[PDB]
Amino acid sequence: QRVTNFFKEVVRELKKVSWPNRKELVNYTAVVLATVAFFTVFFAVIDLGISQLIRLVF
Amino acid sequence: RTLNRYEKIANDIDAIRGDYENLSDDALKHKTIEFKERLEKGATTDDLLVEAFAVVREASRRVTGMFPFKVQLMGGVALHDGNIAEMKTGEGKTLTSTLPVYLNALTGKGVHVVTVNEYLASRDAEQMGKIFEFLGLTVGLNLNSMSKDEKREAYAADITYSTNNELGFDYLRDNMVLYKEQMVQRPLHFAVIDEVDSILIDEARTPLIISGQAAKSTKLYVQANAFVRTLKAEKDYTYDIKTKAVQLTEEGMTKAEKAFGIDNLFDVKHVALNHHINQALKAHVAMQKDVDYVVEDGQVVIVDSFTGRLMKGRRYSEGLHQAIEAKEGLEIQNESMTLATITFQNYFRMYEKLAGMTGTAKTEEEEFRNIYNMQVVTIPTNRPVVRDDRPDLIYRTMEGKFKAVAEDVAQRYMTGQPVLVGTVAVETSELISKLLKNKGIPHQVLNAKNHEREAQIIEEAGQKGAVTIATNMAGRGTDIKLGEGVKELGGLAVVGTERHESRRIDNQLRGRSGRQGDPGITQFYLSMEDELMRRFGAERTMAMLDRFGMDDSTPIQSKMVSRAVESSQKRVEGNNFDSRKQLLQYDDVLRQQREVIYKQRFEVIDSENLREIVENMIKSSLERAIAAYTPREELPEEWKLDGLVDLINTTYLDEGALEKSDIFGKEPDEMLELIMDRIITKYNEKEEQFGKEQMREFEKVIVLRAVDSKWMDHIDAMDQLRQGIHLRAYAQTNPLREYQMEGFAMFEHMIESIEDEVAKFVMKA
Amino acid sequence: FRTISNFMRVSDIRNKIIFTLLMLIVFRIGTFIPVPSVNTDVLKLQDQLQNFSIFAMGVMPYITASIIVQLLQMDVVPKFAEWSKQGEMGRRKLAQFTRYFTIVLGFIQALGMSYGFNNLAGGMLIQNPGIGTYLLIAVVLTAGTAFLMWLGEQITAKGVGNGISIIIFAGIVSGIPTILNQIYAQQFLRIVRLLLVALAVVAVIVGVIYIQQAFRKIPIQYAKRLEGRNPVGGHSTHLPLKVNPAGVIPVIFAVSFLIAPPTIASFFGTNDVTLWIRRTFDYTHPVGMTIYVVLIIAFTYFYAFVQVNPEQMADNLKKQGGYIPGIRPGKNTQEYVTRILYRLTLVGSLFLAFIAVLPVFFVNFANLPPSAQIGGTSLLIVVGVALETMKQLESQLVKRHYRGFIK
Amino acid sequence: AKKTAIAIAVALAGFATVASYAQYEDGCSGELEIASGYYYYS
């Protein structure tokens, strides 16, 4: 059957992909959580600031 | 304005020239001595400018009788300011080079002067060393014939004249000496350059490669080329004429595996054999004989298609010049590992201050600002260019183009003035020769295969009644002369076979006639059936609008199509500027790594207490070894410290010199301090019997051989990695960024291997 | 942290990141300003059961225009084939044609949005529903689109990285402060559920970086080495193929081709077959879910074989350079890499299907606000641009220092 | 072949405009994706 040995082909080829290691994985996770938190608090501060400024200009 | 500054300095030099007259040779050498002592006593080079140029002007008058014009003075000021003074052909570029060389030579460092070849180097060295040694400045001279003592005497003088090749090979052979008294060059101060548009633009990525200790094997070259002489075109190899990309097809690959008796050609075992097949096949399909090179007495000599001229000293890279020499049955200079490599842009990048005149530097002015941060000052001429640079007569059918070329030069030759036409390839020169012999016109043909009579033809080709056909459309040192009759006629007439992709070659061709205010007429009889209009083919509109109004392709003096082909040149040169601007920032990686390790090799060969740096290298190697065998995050007492003490007993200490319990269960800092104290004790014990002399010679030869071998390997590996980084864009990454990161990782692994080799060899003598 | 301190001590790089933060300030003040229509209070009071601004359409026409031109490079068109063949000025002509095509495409789709607003509600209409104020609204929306793409052109040259992608990042993560303001306004599940949700978000970010930053290295070997000259050298040359080559373009395809049959469902007839085909083509419930998954998989295969096309690559490795060890550089290498893409884009397809169906199967098992956006496009864009920006910035500290052997 | 990709691109732009009459599920975005030298011996 094409399906079964093709599944064996896929699961044998996926063991040759250059996956990230655990330390670079947690480095990437730390830096992406740092960037998403930094930019969402930057956006929250600019939300508050521009909201107060358009309150001032009415 | 810089030009107002130049003309007011020129007027000041003329006024103090009125001040300077009727002195003695002893008085002028006293002027040299007093300018040198004024530079000693706090004053700078810019302060002594006017008086120094007045001294050189009067001294050139006294020596050679020729008197510098104010154009040459403002060009000399523009060369002393550290940037480029563009000035037209025939205006005395060597005797405007002679001014800032004297000004920057009084400081006491070593001024260099660059020409394109040794004949112009010797000519300028004689006829300007007269002027310089009229004032006491010792002028040297450099060849490839001189030995190191004569070259050291040359560079050790005040002013050196040489080519760019010998300066580059002397730099790369000073960075391979074993002693500071063997190297020949001084600290690199100044250089004016003749023909900067050829030395820093066209030859700006050409590697000065110093090879060594050839492999001495003709076998694979002659086997591969004897095999590939048995192939059939478009059945065994594809070949497209627009880009020389000769490549085998699958039946050719199968018969290659048949003839060489191998299972698979495209394997890892047969890479050199596959390389020699592809290079021999490119050699005798892509490279046709008298259009891509020329055979000389025992050696292949490269011709190109950008310029018509042929390069004497070059070789082809990647093993192709060996394949050409093997297809013509000659004897072959073999291939080697490169020991050093620099380009012309890196070599003239890492001087201190440089400049140089040229003829055509406007497109290359907007090049030069990006690389050498030099302006290009268009120097106003002495006598105005009075020749007619008329617009070009453009029409299709190259047969009719050559027909009106022949009719034009025929109706010139009826009057009797000489005509220098400019061809690109050899075969268009052959077609012009076959037309002009059938018109009954005698002429002289000067090509890449008739190049022995160049001096005599360019001497007698400006005289009355002489038609010449020149292939080098940019004449660098060759100078036409013309006297009676030709000035009464309309001078030397220039006929352009085509219009190039670069305006510089076209302007160099136009500048052969209007020299020192003389008449001339130039034309560029241009087609639509040529490669420029194929690359710029908007075929239907322009073809029909010049097709309905025709009479056997009558010429059209079209200003709009002149501006259109000027815009075509601007598109091609914008593409070339972007290509060079990409390749520059690809080259800066190995530029920075080479500068770092050459500075550190000079620190090794220059200093005198090197026990400290070898102790630092052993410390870094030992620290990396204990950091390897002691995992930083893992807990102790599983760290295979038996393997660690075996590594120390087989690398630094002797076999039974380090024990088990003395480093057991302690921290890496204190254990590396213990092992470095033990190697300091072993180091002094090893030292104390030949303590001063032979320790330093042994130290220096170990360090220099390790640096040389690992830098040879790093040149090879950065070459291969720059070959293969362009495939990184198939994962949307940046190839320049991954090149810049992996070259740094490979260079740090290189330095780790240098330190490991130095430590192992100085601790296991 | 000391990495941000290392960027704090380099004045040029911190000047560029201050430039990027100020261009995002410009993006924000472009978002806050109202539209010339009067229905802003109407859309505020309604809630339409996303938001609306001058940047409401966004870069989406430029994305789909780039997809249109990279699909019409596959056919027999001598014009665009020769512009792609030309190295630099064909690329600039191609990009300028793409800019013209996206500004006219946004100009017609803003008119389509006006017509869709009129067919949606009678409160969001304008005082002249057939008289052309819609052209003025289309001009000012495409002027906002042109301003943000010129902003992207400025921030890709004077700023840090990919200029379009950084402002798309900025637009797509600017709603999560509203979501986290809403989460405790709806909260009062006390905390255990919220920490479980945060744990699953960190786990799916680990999953998306482990799938995304994963390359398959085919080792290509240029023949240009003399093996009898030196010892063995380059293992550092290879062909990196991704696991998911396509990106988010198949997910945007599935959004397009499952929101296009609701126009036929917005027939004026509104028949029983109309309500049945609208009940089958909606993906919040399995009849549309399976169509969404299978159409994502089909267009992952399609857009993989468009942009990492094996025949053009096998010809580029045949013409200038070298081969794969054991495999002839003609059609055998193209068959080999077609096998490789068959085995990689299946995993990329399953990945895009799974992560694109996480929001529907997430807001159900965590009944916390339905406007919350994690998963799919909303996750892959932010994670890819966020770590690609740091992988672009950390390639300068390795340039900064060369520590030699003397130290 | 070639007209297949023509039909796919035309239907893609068509149904993109068709879904873009409404685009009521929006907030999703998108990220698109010869050599000589001077040699010298010893």
Ligand SMILES: Nc1ncnc2c1ncn2[C@@H]1O[C@H](COP(=O)(O)OP(=O)(O)O)[C@@H](O)[C@H]1O
């Ligand atoms: N001030 C001058 N007075 C008289 N002859 C000069 C003067 N300057 C230059 N020349 C002559 O003009 C010739 C120009 O030759 P060259 O300098 O090689 O041309 P180019 O300037 O195009 O390189 C020289 O042979 C030189 O003798």
Ligand SMILES: [Mg+2]
């Ligand atoms: Mg000259």
